[PDB]
Amino acid sequence: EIVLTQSPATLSLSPGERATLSCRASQGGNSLNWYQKRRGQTPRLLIYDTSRRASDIPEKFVGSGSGTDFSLTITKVGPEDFAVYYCQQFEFFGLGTTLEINRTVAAPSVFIFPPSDEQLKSGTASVVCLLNNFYPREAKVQWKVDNALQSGNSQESVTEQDSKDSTYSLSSTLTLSKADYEKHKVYACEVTHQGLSSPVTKSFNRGEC
Amino acid sequence: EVQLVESGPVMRKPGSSMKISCATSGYNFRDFSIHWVRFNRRYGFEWIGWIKPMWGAVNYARQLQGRVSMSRLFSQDLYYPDRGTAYLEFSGLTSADTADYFCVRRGSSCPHCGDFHFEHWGQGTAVVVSAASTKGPSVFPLAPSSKALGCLVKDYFPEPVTVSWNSGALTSGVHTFPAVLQSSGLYSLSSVVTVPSSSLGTQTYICNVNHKPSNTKVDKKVEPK
Amino acid sequence: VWKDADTTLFCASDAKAHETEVHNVWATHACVPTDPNPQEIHLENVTENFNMWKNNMVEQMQEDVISLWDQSLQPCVKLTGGSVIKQACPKISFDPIPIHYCTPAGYVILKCNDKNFNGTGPCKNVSSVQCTHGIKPVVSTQLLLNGSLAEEEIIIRSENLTNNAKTIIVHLNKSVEINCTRPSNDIRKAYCEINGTKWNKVLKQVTEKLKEHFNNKTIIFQPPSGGDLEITMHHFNCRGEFFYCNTTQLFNNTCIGNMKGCNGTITLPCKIKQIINMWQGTGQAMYAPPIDGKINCVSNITGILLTRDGGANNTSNETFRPGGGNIKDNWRSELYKYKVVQIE
Numbered sequence: 051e052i053v054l055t056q057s058p059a060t061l062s063l064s065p066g067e068r069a070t071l072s073c074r075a076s077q078g079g080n081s082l083n084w085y086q087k088r089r090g091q092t093p094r095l096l097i098y099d100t101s102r103r104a105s106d107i108p109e110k111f112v113g114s115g116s117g118t119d120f121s122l123t124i125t126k127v128g129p130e131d132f133a134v135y136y137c138q139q140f141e142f143f144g145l146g147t148t149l150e151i152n153r154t155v156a157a158p159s160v161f162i163f164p165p166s167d168e169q170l171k172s173g174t175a176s177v178v179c180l181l182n183n184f185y186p187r188e189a190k191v192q193w194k195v196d197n198a199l200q201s202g203n204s205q206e207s208v209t210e211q212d213s214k215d216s217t218y219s220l221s222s223t224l225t226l227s228k229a230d231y232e233k234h235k236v237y238a239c240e241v242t243h244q245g246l247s248s249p250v251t252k253s254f255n256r257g258e259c
Numbered sequence: 260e261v262q263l264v265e266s267g268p269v270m271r272k273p274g275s276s277m278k279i280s281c282a283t284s285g286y287n288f289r290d291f292s293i294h295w296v297r298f299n300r301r302y303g304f305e306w307i308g309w310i311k312p313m314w315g316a317v318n319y320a321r322q323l324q325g326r327v328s329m330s331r332l333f334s335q336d337l338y339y340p341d342r343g344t345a346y347l348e349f350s351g352l353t354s355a356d357t358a359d360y361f362c363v364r365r366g367s368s369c370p371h372c373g374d375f376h377f378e379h380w381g382q383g384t385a386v387v388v389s390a391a392s393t394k395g396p397s398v399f400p401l402a403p404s405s406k407a408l409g410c411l412v413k414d415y416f417p418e419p420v421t422v423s424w425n426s427g428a429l430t431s432g433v434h435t436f437p438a439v440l441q442s443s444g445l446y447s448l449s450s451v452v453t454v455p456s457s458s459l460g461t462q463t464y465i466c467n468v469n470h471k472p473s474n475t476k477v478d479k480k481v482e483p484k
Numbered sequence: 485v486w487k488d489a490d491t492t493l494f495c496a497s498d499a500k501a502h503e504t505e506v507h508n509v510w511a512t513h514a515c516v517p518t519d520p521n522p523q524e525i526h527l528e529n530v531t532e533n534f535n536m537w538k539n540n541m542v543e544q545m546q547e548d549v550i551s552l553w554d555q556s557l558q559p560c561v562k563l564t565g566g567s568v569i570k571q572a573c574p575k576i577s578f579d580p581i582p583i584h585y586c587t588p589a590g591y592v593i594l595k596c597n598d599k600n601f602n603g604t605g606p607c608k609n610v611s612s613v614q615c616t617h618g619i620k621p622v623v624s625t626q627l628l629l630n631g632s633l634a635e636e637e638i639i640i641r642s643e644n645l646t647n648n649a650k651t652i653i654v655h656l657n658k659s660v661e662i663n664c665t666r667p668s669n670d671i672r673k674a675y676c677e678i679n680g681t682k683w684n685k686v687l688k689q690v691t692e693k694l695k696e697h698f699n700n701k702t703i704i705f706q707p708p709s710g711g712d713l714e715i716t717m718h719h720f721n722c723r724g725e726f727f728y729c730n731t732t733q734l735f736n737n738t739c740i741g742n743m744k745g746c747n748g749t750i751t752l753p754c755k756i757k758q759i760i761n762m763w764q765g766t767g768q769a770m771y772a773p774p775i776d777g778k779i780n781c782v783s784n785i786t787g788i789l790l791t792r793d794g795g796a797n798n799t800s801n802e803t804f805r806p807g808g809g810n811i812k813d814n815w816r817s818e819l820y821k822y823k824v825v826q827i828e
């Protein structure tokens with residue numbers, strides 16, 4: 051079979067920059083295809099047979115390559131050209147590459163939300179922490195229950211790129227039983243990030259306003 | 260133009276089977292092979308197989324032998340012939356068979372180009388497989404601190420859930436996160452909205468969570484304390 | 485000096501005016517008599533590039549054999565998409581004759597004389613002729629009948645071997661007879677006798693010759709994954725009757741060489757159908773019941789049509805299943821070594 055590597059995965063393209071990826075296929079001697087896929091929508095073919103544009107496609111999409119390595123090129127990236135990109139060789143497919151809008155600063159802001167009383171009457175508690183923006187995506191959201199660092203009992207929800215301001219957002223939800231929640235008092239969220247001079251902690255005490 | 264249209268969303272218990280159709284139009288059904296591709300969520304793409312509707316000849320992927328069968332059917336009408344639907348049968352469903360399934364066809368353009376240049380994609384068919392059952396969500400408030408506000412949509416199945424505020428009057432500053440699959444087999448997501456801290460005693464905020472599979476609609480009002 | 489070009493060819497044969505047979509009647513009105521003194525000019529110091537997969541000669545022959553079959557073979561009933569066409573269906577005399585294809589003035593057919601020529605590469609020994617050799621328009625699936633053999637060794641033909649959507653043509657350097665019979669007394673039930681000792685001997689070589697093109701790994705045959713009976717079985721026509729034979733035994737990979745006791749005569753379960761799917765791509769056709777007496781069609785197997793079953797072959801074996809389906813590929817089996825060029 052044939053291996054297809056799409057390294058690297060993502061890069062920050064300022065509106066107007068040029069893209070250059072690498073489809074270092076295992077066994078050359080063949081061609082390659084390219085697909086633009088805005089997630090939630092269907093893939094759109096762009097370049098077929100190593101280097102050829104498909105029907106009704108703007109000439110900003112440029113493809114080339116030979117042997118094992120291949121290259122795609124976009125001239126002046128548009129607002130709807132930020133998506134995923136995949137290459138193929140016959141029955142064997144690639145993994146994909148993501149495009150992202152740049153700048154953006156470096157600092158995350160942090161809201162905290164205690165579980166509602168209505169939910170406690172069901173036997174479970176959900177502590178939701180809210181982050182806006184925060185690039186780079188390397189986060190270190192640490193949960194602290196009475197200064198006891200928590201791990202393995204929370205889950206995260208990240209990307210939702212807005213075309214208006216190129217901002218991010220992120221949720222990490224802590225799930226505990228009704229019992230364990232009332233067992234402790236202080237609940238904090240430790241957001242350690244590179245664009246933060248010092249780790250920001252937002253907290254609340256159980257039962258208070 | 261050439262279009263490919265597939266059947267609606269599908270959820271199946273593990274061990275079950277599914278038959279997905281794929282209506283075609285805008286070209287001659289006989290002249291082109293139809294391949295089936297599933298957009299493997301966070302796995303990329305895995306090619307399933309093709310069918311040449313001349314004799315219904317098929318070639319199934321080796322890593323799917325004994326679980327997949329394909330067939331075709333030509334147009335019944337005498338006034339609108341040359342069309343036709345293609346079909347995909349999938350048996351013995353488990354966990355890894357949760358994906359978005361597409362019917363594709365090689366774009367009509369060149370001769371030398373091999374039979375794997377998919378220019379035409381169907382709208383797709385989302386397919387979920389678990390032991391969970393259709394359930395309507397509860398809606399708890401993420402109340403604003405007295406020192407943003409939102410709604411968390413928890414314990415529902417299956418996808419999706421759409422989120423709008425005040426019947427679609429407040430759209431700016433709204434952040435509806437993607438759903439997360441809990442260990443319980445049921446989904447959950449979070450939706451928040453940043454608003455002025457002065458309008459927390461004069462403005463009413465309401466989140467319209469919608470869940471069509473369970474035919475559920477909740478009107479929730481988020482307030483401080 | 486010449487140039488690769490395409491033009492309208494004309495057919496030539498030895499068809500006889502008194503013959504009531506289907507192919508003779510067509511060739512009478514459609515062809516000219518065979519030239520009694522064919523000449524071949526060997527071009528020295530001249531190489532040339534061929535491609536049997538892009539050959540307009542193929543698309544012309546296809547257009548003619550369709551005409552032949554539309555003129556004579558007429559079903560009692562036939563769908564026209566949403567309606568039916570009820571025509572005339574008398575029993576006919578059916579036995580395909582050799583049909584030469586020839587070039588007009590200003591043009592010449594170039595012939596590849598390289599023995600181990602696979603169909604796509606360049607040739608070293610090229611000659612010029614005016615007409616192709618005698619080619620019977622035998623339509624069939626899975627197996628190629630009454631055709632030409634390979635010059636030296638078994639030759640594997642394919643547009644792209646790494647492409648599973650490309651049908652494979654196995655050109656046999658040694659042919660094996662297939663004796664098909666419908667005895668005269670359940671009147672639909674026929675059979676095909678084949679010398680088993682000679683078949684798996686040839687199929688042994690086919691397996692070995694195929695291992696060269698796939699990194700020396702094991703090679704196993706499997707029954708077709710699906711489709712219409714015409715493609716899942718050995719479909720063909722003898723004496724105007726449509727035969728369908730089960731070829732499961734023909735690919736008994738267990739009995740290939742090894743464990744050693746698999747000799748003798750093998751017979752294939754066959755049936756004669758009156759309701760078929762037209763290879764014309766025109767739909768379904770209903771024919772009249774068979775004719776009385778012993779129907780017998782002793783044919784030669786000259787080639788096999790395979791499609792590589794391909795996916796994520798993590799294991800060390802390629803799976804090959806029989807089945808052509810594309811009758812244009814039947815013509816390429818004979819027209820592979822010819823190319824039409826325009827002179828100056």
Ligand SMILES: *[C@@H]1O[C@H](CO)[C@@H](O)[C@H](O)[C@H]1NC(C)=O
Pocket residue numbers: 079080081371372373604643644647
């Ligand atoms: C082999 O397949 C490639 C597509 O990957 C195609 O471009 C090429 O023409 C094929 N080779 C030959 C000799 O036709």
Ligand SMILES: *[C@@H]1O[C@H](CO)[C@@H](O)[C@H](O)[C@H]1NC(C)=O
Pocket residue numbers: 602603604605606640641642645
């Ligand atoms: C036929 O020979 C040519 C030239 O040597 C080569 O490029 C091609 O791969 C061969 N094809 C097959 C099917 O062996």
Ligand SMILES: *[C@@H]1O[C@H](CO)[C@@H](O)[C@H](O)[C@H]1NC(C)=O
Pocket residue numbers: 526597598599608609611
């Ligand atoms: C030259 O052509 C003859 C007849 O056409 C053929 O048999 C022979 O193999 C060719 N010679 C060489 C050296 O290939």
Ligand SMILES: *[C@@H]1O[C@H](CO)[C@@H](O)[C@H](O)[C@H]1NC(C)=O
Pocket residue numbers: 630631659783784
């Ligand atoms: C069958 O094959 C033999 C050689 O094995 C040949 O002499 C005969 O002409 C063939 N019959 C045809 C082509 O109809």
Ligand SMILES: *[C@@H]1O[C@H](CO)[C@@H](O)[C@H](O)[C@H]1NC(C)=O
Pocket residue numbers: 636637638639657658689693
């Ligand atoms: C047919 O070709 C094979 C090699 O492909 C060779 O071993 C065998 O001897 C040939 N058969 C005859 C009868 O020449």
Ligand SMILES: *[C@@H]1O[C@H](CO)[C@@H](O)[C@H](O)[C@H]1NC(C)=O
Pocket residue numbers: 663664665677782
């Ligand atoms: C073919 O087989 C039939 C019996 O099925 C027999 O009568 C006939 O003589 C055989 N012909 C040849 C050429 O072996």
Ligand SMILES: *[C@@H]1O[C@H](CO)[C@@H](O)[C@H](O)[C@H]1NC(C)=O
Pocket residue numbers: 679680681682748749
């Ligand atoms: C099969 O053919 C072989 C020659 O390869 C011959 O010796 C043998 O007698 C044939 N078998 C039968 C049953 O006629």
Ligand SMILES: *[C@@H]1O[C@H](CO)[C@@H](O)[C@H](O)[C@H]1NC(C)=O
Pocket residue numbers: 716717730731732
């Ligand atoms: C052919 O025969 C085999 C075994 O005898 C059987 O498994 C297969 O289904 C048959 N094919 C048909 C009836 O199309």
Ligand SMILES: *[C@@H]1O[C@H](CO)[C@@H](O)[C@H](O)[C@H]1NC(C)=O
Pocket residue numbers: 732733736738739745746747
């Ligand atoms: C394969 O060959 C073996 C050995 O003679 C035989 O027992 C078996 O029936 C064959 N399989 C078939 C004919 O499907």
Ligand SMILES: *[C@@H]1O[C@H](CO)[C@@H](O)[C@H](O)[C@H]1NC(C)=O
Pocket residue numbers: 579580622629630720721722723781782783784
């Ligand atoms: C093969 O040729 C023989 C005569 O050479 C003929 O009787 C037989 O019908 C032919 N086979 C087919 C399938 O037409």
